[PDB]
Design a protein around this ligand. Structure first.
Ligand SMILES: *[C@@H]1O[C@H](CO)[C@@H](O[C@@H]2O[C@H](CO)[C@@H](O)[C@H](O)[C@H]2NC(C)=O)[C@H](O)[C@H]1NC(C)=O
Ligand SMILES: *[C@@H]1O[C@H](CO)[C@@H](O[C@@H]2O[C@H](CO)[C@@H](O)[C@H](O)[C@H]2NC(C)=O)[C@H](O)[C@H]1NC(C)=O
Ligand SMILES: *[C@@H]1O[C@H](CO)[C@@H](O)[C@H](O)[C@H]1NC(C)=O
Ligand SMILES: *[C@@H]1O[C@H](CO)[C@@H](O)[C@H](O)[C@H]1NC(C)=O
Ligand SMILES: *[C@@H]1O[C@H](CO)[C@@H](O)[C@H](O)[C@H]1NC(C)=O
Lengths: 170, 336, 92, 96, 48
């Protein structure tokens, strides 16, 4: 047997005292005991570790992952698509599926959108993205993402002694 | 004049599953042995997607009734009636009424909003929070399409329409009418001549205000009063926790770790153990999916009833006995 | 070959690891097996090993390895597991 | 389709053809493969039946609602709001 | 009645009585038959 170097803060194959696997590790505020050497969780999974040599506590957290969604306006109209990575901060993602990212990166509450432009207008929801965000294909034409609107705005002229009566039907 | 309340569930939590990570994990040989099966995960994904879209359809059907946004006039005088306990409060940053706050502070959700994004469960933070532990097995929770700032807008629009235009806004254009005349119209509807209201307006207004204050106070000093809206959260949490905990079982295999079966042994006898583990976990997933389907059907029935009540009690006056409250119906007001 | 407007799900994504951490960190005696007359089957001689590093092929190469049959274990895996708990009985 | 497509899976057996399983080996160890195939097919059938039952319940609820609408909106005139169309209801006509 | 009657099924095992399996065959191969029988009874309960 032999030994190698000790790296931190990057989710890589860890092998602390035999125990193998993968995960990212950061600092922690927890106390082991002199007879304590290994951590656990609510569902039989390692949480923290004690260095077999340096004798301090680190943790374990597997790398990020999640689903992938493709948003398309239909092959009949165009051939452009947008990609949504569910539940992952994409300032922290850079592997599977597409190996090449791009520009026009928008951060939402249900992941982050790649290849779509964010505008300030408000239309009806065409393709539901989530958390109040929708997407559409519009004009040079491209895919845009916006916040859905609830309808027109009007106020009823309520008054002390005013009543409106119809004069014709349909 | 009596004011009663009725609580109705409308939707449950959207969920997604992943066989590749849950069943096997980071083992390619187990992935190949799972690919050996024809198709036992396309159906699960399809069913969960159907449930997820059905929840949004339920919410949209119940709440998105009128495609207009009415606003109450700046001067809040309605003939002595005093609706400040159900109209939105501009003082708070959230635009919720002083009653919706009580309904929101008495239900303990799992995680309001979604800020995790696999960037919060870092270090010792993971494996202590329940949400991180669930998210680290292959189970994710999707956010709803309509946030909590739009349902409040819908309810406020409905309230403004029903207190500034009667029931005429649910059958065409909105036509304004003074409130002490809408009251007379409703009194004539139930079978009492309209001069009773015009001669007892002050007493009726005082009784209405007292009833509103009474329910506002009594919604807090009560043991539960909200079990229907808590049972959905409790059931979802319990089901997810059981599904996560099911991984520790052996199902007759020599070990519960996939890395001690593929390795530490030979293929011809490790195939049996891997097959046993895969079959057990697949059966657990199937049981979870079937339970979710049944619960979704029940929630759909409840949402249909809620939509019917919203259409009939609020947007009009109902002559059905014991449908919209107990007694002779006058009107109703919605809250989220 | 033609798809309609909407949003669909596809293959998932994962972040791969980069390096490999290793922070693993004796020679127990085999003499009593080699020393003394090997007894009979009803008086087998047992040795218990603990907290040591063993070497099987060094001991077996001295002898003539005729046959090897096991249960719940294999000779391939007998030289790969950790020390755990280990008891060897030798006899004639 | 799914049900038929479930007939091309050996469920961990060496092959998915009954005659092939019977031949080329001794029946005592063919019995385990046969039972594996039988259990897989039975599980597929049970899943199909359960999903059919759930869908039948949903269709039954829809049919009950349709019968109620036919009884109330068509054969008479209903005052229930938005039950028989937006606006003030006058009359309904059915079509198959 | 169906649930009660379903108890008398081999489920691919050597016998349907727990005494007859624990009498002649050594545990290493009795575990397989017991596992099959238990899995079958679990399936019956789940369907019910
Ligand atoms: C009520 O509305 C209808 C619909 O527009 C009116 O009917 C129109 O009347 C004038 C007559 O010259 C024309 O604009 C059209 O020829 C009519 N349309 C139809 C479809 O007949 C009707 O006049 C209105 N009633 C009143 C009292 O103004
Ligand atoms: C409508 O109801 C509100 C709520 O009770 C009344 O506001 C109260 O006013 C009194 C007297 O100024 C205060 O002591 C209370 O603290 C107020 N309550 C709250 C919650 O702020 C209000 O007076 C009623 N009538 C009108 C016309 O607004
Ligand atoms: C993504 O990570 C950055 C790190 O600088 C952080 O500031 C940001 O808040 C994260 N995104 C979300 C939605 O929390
Ligand atoms: C949208 O609004 C943000 C902040 O209100 C502003 O920075 C941005 O320029 C706006 N974009 C457009 C196209 O108006
Ligand atoms: C008319 O409305 C305002 C509301 O403040 C007020 O002058 C009065 O209460 C109402 N009734 C009248 C003027 O008869």
């Amino acid at each position: 047997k032999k030994s190698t170097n000790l790296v931190k803060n990057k989710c890589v194959n860890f092998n602390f005292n035999g125990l193998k696997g993968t995960g990212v590790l950061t600092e922690s505020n927890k106390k082991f005991l002199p007879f304590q050497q290994f951590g656990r969780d609510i569902a039989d999974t390692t949480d923290a570790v004690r260095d077999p040599q340096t004798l301090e506590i680190l943790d374990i957290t597997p790398c990020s992952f999640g689903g992938v969604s493709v948003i398309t306006p239909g092959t009949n109209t165009s051939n452009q698509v947008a990609v949504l990575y569910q539940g992952v901060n994409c300032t922290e993602v850079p592997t599977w599926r597409v190996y090449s990212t791009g520009s026009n990166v928008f951060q939402t509450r249900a992941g982050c959108l790649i290849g779509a432009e964010y505008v300030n207008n408000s239309y009806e929801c065409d393709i539901p993205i989530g958390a109040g965000i929708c997407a559409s294909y519009q004009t040079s034409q491209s895919i845009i993402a916006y916040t859905m609107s609830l309808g027109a705005e009007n106020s009823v002229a309520y008054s002390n002694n005013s009543i409106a009566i119809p004069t014709n039907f349909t | 004049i009596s004011v009663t309340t009725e609580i109705l569930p409308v939707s449950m939590t959207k969920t997604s599953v992943d066989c590749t990570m849950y069943i096997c994990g980071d083992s390619t040989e187990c992935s190949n042995l799972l690919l050996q099966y024809g198709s036992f995960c396309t159906q699960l994904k399809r069913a969960l997607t159907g449930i997820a879209v059905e929840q949004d359809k339920n919410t949209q059907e119940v709440f998105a009734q009128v495609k207009q946004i009415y606003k109450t006039p700046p001067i809040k005088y309605f003939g002595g009636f005093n609706f400040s306990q159900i109209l939105p409060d501009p003082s708070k940053p959230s635009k919720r009424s002083p009653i919706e706050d009580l309904l929101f502070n008495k239900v303990t959700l799992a995680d309001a909003g979604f800020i995790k994004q696999y960037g919060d469960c870092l270090g010792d933070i993971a494996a202590r929070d329940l949400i991180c532990a669930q998210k680290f097995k292959g189970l994710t929770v999707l956010p709803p399409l309509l946030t909590d700032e739009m349902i409040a807008q819908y309810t406020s629009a409905l309230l403004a329409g029903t207190i500034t235009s009667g029931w005429t806004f649910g059958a065409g254009p909105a036509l304004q009418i003074p409130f002490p005349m809408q009251m007379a119209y409703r009194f004539n509807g139930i079978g009492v001549t309209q001069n009773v209201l015009y001669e007892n307006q002050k007493l009726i207004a005082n009784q209405f205000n007292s009833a509103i204050g009474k329910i506002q106070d009594s919604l807090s000093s009560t043991p539960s009063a909200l079990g229907k809206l808590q049972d959905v959260v409790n059931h979802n949490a319990q089901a997810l926790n059981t599904l996560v905990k099911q991984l520790s079982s052996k199902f007759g295999a020599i070990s519960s770790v996939l890395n001690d079966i593929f390795s530490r042994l030979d293929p011809p006898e490790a195939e049996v153990q891997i097959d046993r583990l895969i079959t057990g976990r697949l059966q657990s997933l199937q049981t979870y999916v079937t339970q979710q389907l049944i619960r979704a059907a029940e929630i759909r029935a409840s949402a249909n009833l809620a939509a019917t009540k919203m259409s009939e009690c609020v947007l009009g006056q109902s002559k059905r006995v014991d449908f919209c409250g107990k007694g002779y119906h006058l009107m109703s007001f919605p809250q989220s | 070959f033609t798809v309609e407007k909407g949003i669909y799900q596809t293959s998932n994504f994962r972040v791969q690891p980069t390096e490999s951490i290793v922070r693993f960190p004796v020679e127990c005696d085999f003499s009593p097996l080699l020393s003394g007359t090997p007894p009979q089957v009803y008086n087998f001689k047992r040795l218990v090993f603990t907290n040591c590093n063993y070497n099987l092929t060094k001991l077996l190469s001295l002898f003539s390895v005729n046959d090897f049959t096991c249960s719940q274990i294999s000779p391939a895996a007998i030289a790969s597991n950790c020390y755990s708990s280990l008891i060897l009985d030798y006899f004639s």
